[PDB]
Design a protein around this ligand. Structure first.
Ligand SMILES: *[C@@H]1O[C@H](CO)[C@@H](O)[C@H](O)[C@H]1NC(C)=O
Ligand SMILES: [Ca+2]
Ligand SMILES: [Ca+2]
Ligand SMILES: [Cl-]
Ligand SMILES: [Cl-]
Ligand SMILES: [Cl-]
Ligand SMILES: [Cl-]
Length: 562
């Protein structure tokens, strides 16, 4: 008897790009609500929305000026309630994006902090630095912002530097201040009171920095993986990431969630965005005395799998996650989000179905970034139309290395105007040029298509074998990854993923003891010609390049487990 989330399908909506409902070219809450039934029909359980709160959009919602307010163009609190009520009818859990690390520099708390307001003077991390030789100002430490340059920003009015781990428009909250601690968990209660099933928590590794010692902040040592001192990777982040107090606060936040779970037998869940080392990701699950996040994102895989990764490479990172995961915790698999190039563009357009197969058939929790289920691809956007500050802080020659906008374009619903995302003359980001032939409606009608493969996976994974089965991973050569998932007296599933360009015979008898000369085809990559439901020889079947196949053998019935 699993809790709702343990084998859950989670879908990330980027609200600005999901569905426009009021003709301004901007996705909004009412637009999401129109589309929640679609999300249920493709097998989703939990819907996570990126920042919908009041924010000047310097970082497109991650710079929040009021954590208790819906941003105007997205809607109002009624629009939120209708979204929440619709989720409840459909049996979907709503997950909101919680951004504790920083506020907008337009937040009232920050404006008052700059003025040394007695209540807000210490809401942020301020330090004067030191005046140096030749009347120069030395910042309080050598720390580098994730968006490049110093993470200390001088404020003339206050005559101090404030800490910004992200943009200078995003001042870091001082979680050593108890007033800040209390205020931010009341933000969680505010939304828990309004019905949400949990939160995805932004930038968890960066919450606490180390404290002052003898009036100074400690510098960080050079990493020697780059010579560029404006690049955050220039330093080893011994002082600005992975601090022990960070984990303490995650656990405090989970306790607030647990207060609400006791109320009504509906587990509030926590997801955490942590681009950090695998052991420091794992620590977010919890420790001996305290639970943390049920879903600290498996960014071990996403950060290390590349376009030229082999099947062996993919297996290495999958196995590394599994070897490090504590037995009492659930895995999750994620290969896309709003900060990465779209999966097909990033990892190889031919592998869209291979990777959707992996994401959906590996154990426990599967994550989908909006559009991955139809195989959306990045859209190149001109410098003049790009809005992502990570691009605009670069230059016309080279903003495409940095820009996240190509992965944030409007969802492609149909072949009509703006791919059916909006009736407006212009959309906030351009619709991808491929939209007439890549959209939900066209894939819905096709015999085989990414969406039909996707839908087959999200349904099939909810049966007993893929819900309850173990996992046994084997690699043949450099590029044939195969894994078996078995439930005794029920059956077993074999996933075979061919990352290489050459076709290959599965040769399963030389990989598992397990016989059954023949297995039944459940689903396969778009280019595989083998019809569904036929039987194939597990030794001689040839899997074409860059393709995957899901194979089944039943001893008993394999029911949907609800
Ligand atoms: C794969 O690509 C990366 C980055 O583009 C490169 O550094 C690496 O050498 C490539 N691997 C091979 C085997 O060429
Ligand atoms: Ca709109
Ligand atoms: Ca911080
Ligand atoms: Cl519209
Ligand atoms: Cl857990
Ligand atoms: Cl099925
Ligand atoms: Cl048979």
């Amino acid at each position: 008897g699993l809790d709702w989330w343990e084998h859950g399908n989670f879908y990330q909506v980027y609200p600005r790009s999901f569905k426009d409902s009021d003709g301004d070219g901007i996705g909004d809450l009412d637009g999401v609500t129109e589309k929640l039934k679609y999300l249920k029909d493709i097998g989703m359980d939990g819907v996570w929305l990126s920042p919908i709160f009041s924010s000047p959009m310097a970082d497109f919602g991650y710079d929040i000026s009021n954590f208790r307010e819906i941003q105007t163009e997205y809607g109002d609190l009624d629009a939120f309630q209708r979204l929440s009520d619709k989720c409840k009818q459909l049996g979907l859990h709503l997950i909101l994006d919680f951004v504790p690390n920083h506020t907008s520099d337009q937040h009232e708390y920050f404006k008052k902090s700059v003025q040394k307001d007695e209540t807000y003077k210490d809401f942020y991390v301020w330090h004067p630095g030191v005046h140096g030789p030749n009347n120069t100002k030395v910042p309080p430490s050598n720390w580098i912002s994730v968006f490049r340059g110093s993470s200390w920003e001088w404020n003339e009015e206050r005559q101090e530097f404030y800490l910004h781990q992200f943009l200078k428009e995003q001042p870091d909250l001082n979680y050593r201040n108890p007033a800040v601690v209390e205020e931010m968990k009341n933000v969680l209660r505010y939304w828990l009171d309004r019905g949400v099933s949990g939160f995805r928590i932004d930038a968890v590794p960066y919450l606490f920095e180390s404290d002052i010692i003898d009036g100074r902040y400690r510098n960080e040592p050079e990493s020697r993986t780059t010579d560029d001192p404006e690049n955050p990777a220039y330093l080893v982040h011994t002082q600005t990431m992975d601090q022990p107090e960070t984990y303490d606060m995650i656990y405090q936040w989970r306790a607030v969630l647990d207060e609400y779970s006791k109320t009504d037998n509906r587990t509030r869940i926590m997801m955490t965005e942590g681009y950090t080392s695998l052991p420091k990701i794992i620590e977010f699950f919890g420790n001996a005395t305290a639970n943390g996040a049920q879903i600290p994102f498996n960014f071990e895989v996403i950060s290390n799998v590349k376009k030229n990764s082999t099947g062996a490479d993919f297996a290495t990172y999958v196995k590394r996650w599994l070897d490090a995961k504590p037995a009492n915790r659930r895995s999750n698999w994620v290969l896309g989000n709003h900060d990465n190039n779209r999966l097909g563009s990033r990892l190889g357009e031919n592998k869209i179905d291979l990777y959707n197969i992996a994401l959906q058939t590996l154990p426990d929790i599967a994550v989908t970034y909006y559009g991955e289920e139809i195989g959306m691809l990045d859209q190149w956007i001109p410098w003049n139309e790009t809005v992502d500050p990570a691009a605009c802080r670069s230059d016309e020659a080279s903003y495409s290395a940095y820009s996240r906008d190509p992965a944030r374009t409007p969802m492609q619903w149909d072949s009509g105007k703006n791919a059916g995302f909006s009736k407006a003359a212009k959309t906030w980001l351009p619709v991808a040029d491929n939209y007439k032939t890549l959209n939900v409606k066209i894939q819905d009608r096709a015999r085989k298509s990414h969406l039909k493969i996707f839908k087959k996976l999200t349904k099939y994974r909810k049966r007993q074998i893929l819900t309850e089965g173990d996992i046994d991973i084997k690699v043949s050569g450099e590029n044939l990854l195969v894994y078996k998932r078995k439930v005794d007296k029920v059956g077993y599933v074999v996933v075979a993923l061919n990352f290489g360009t050459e076709p290959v015979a599965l040769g399963l008898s030389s990989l598992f003891d397990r016989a059954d000369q023949r297995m039944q085809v459940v689903v396969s990559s778009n280019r595989v010609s083998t019809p569904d439901n036929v039987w194939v020889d597990v030794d001689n079947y040839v899997l074409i390049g860059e393709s995957g196949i899901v194979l089944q053998y039943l001893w008993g019935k394999n029911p949907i487990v609800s």
